[PDB]
C-alpha cells in the first residue's frame, strides 16, 4: 500500500511546521520570578517535560497520541514539540521550578536567584 | 518615536504575536460516520468567546479572542489574542448546519453532519 506510506509522508510534512514553531510562548518577570506561559493544548500532563540548561536554557518537551480514522484532510497538530528558551537570568540553584497545566495552557514559574525558599523538615 | 523603547517593544509584539496569529491554531480535519470533524489546539480561551461560523456552505471559520495579562517586564510575546482560521470544506454543508462541539483542555472539536433536517414552528 503505497497510498499508506504516502499519507504518512504528507502527515509529517503538514504537522512538520507546527512541531517546529509551536508552542507560542510568553515570558516575563514578576514578584522576583521568571514566568513562562505557553499555549500547549491537549496534552497528557505526564507527557510534558522541562529543565534548565546550565542556569540559562529552559527546555520544554511534549508528546501525545494522535489517531484519527480515514479521509484525513488536514493534519497540522503537532505530535512532538520541543521549545528552547533563553533565560534572562541565572536560576536559583536548588531550584523550585513549579508548573500548572490547565485549559491547555502551560504556566511555569521560575525562581530568579535570591528571592524565596520554603519548607524545612 | 520619540522614545525608541516604546515603539520597539510595540513593534516586536503584535508582529511576533501576529506571526502566530496566522498559523494558529493547528487544525486537524477528517471524516468518519458521515461527520466532517475538526480538531484544533485552541488553549487558554474562554468558551463564551469561541465561535465557529460556516460561510456560504463552504467555509468553516473558527474565531476566538482573549486578553493577556502582560505586566512587566516583558521578554517574549508570541501568544495570539485574536484567532481566526479559515478552513475550506470538502463538501457543501447545508445551511441547516447543526454544528456541535466541545472544548476540553485547550482542544476545540467541532462536528458537521451530512446532512440534516429542521424543526417545525419557525420558518
TrEMBL record, chain A:
<dbReference type="InterPro" id="IPR002068">
    <property type="entry name" value="A-crystallin/Hsp20_dom"/>
</dbReference>
<protein>
    <submittedName>
        <fullName>Small heat shock protein StHsp14.0</fullName>
    </submittedName>
</protein>
<comment type="similarity">
    <text>Belongs to the small heat shock protein (HSP20) family.</text>
</comment>
<dbReference type="Pfam" id="PF00011">
    <property type="entry name" value="HSP20"/>
</dbReference>
<feature type="domain" description="SHSP">
    <location>
        <begin position="16"/>
        <end position="121"/>
    </location>
</feature>
<keyword id="KW-0346">Stress response</keyword>
<dbReference type="InterPro" id="IPR008978">
    <property type="entry name" value="HSP20-like_chaperone"/>
</dbReference>
Amino acid at each position: 500500500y503505497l497510498g499508506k506510506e504516502l499519507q504518512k509522508r504528507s502527515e509529517e510534512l503538514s504537522r512538520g511546521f507546527y512541531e517546529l514553531v509551536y508552542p507560542p510562548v510568553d515570558m516575563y518577570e514578576e514578584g522576583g520570578y521568571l514566568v513562562v506561559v505557553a499555549d500547549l493544548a491537549g496534552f497528557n500532563k505526564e507527557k510534558i517535560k522541562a529543565r534548565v540548561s546550565g542556569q540559562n536554557e529552559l527546555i520544554i518537551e511534549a508528546e501525545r497520541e494522535i489517531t484519527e480514522p480515514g479521509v484525513k484532510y488536514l493534519t497540522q497538530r503537532p505530535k512532538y514539540v520541543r521549545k528552547v528558551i533563553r533565560l534572562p537570568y541565572n536560576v536559583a540553584k536548588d531550584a523550585e521550578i513549579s508548573g500548572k497545566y490547565e485549559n491547555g495552557v502551560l504556566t511555569i514559574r521560575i525562581p530568579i536567584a535570591g528571592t524565596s525558599v520554603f519548607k524545612f523538615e
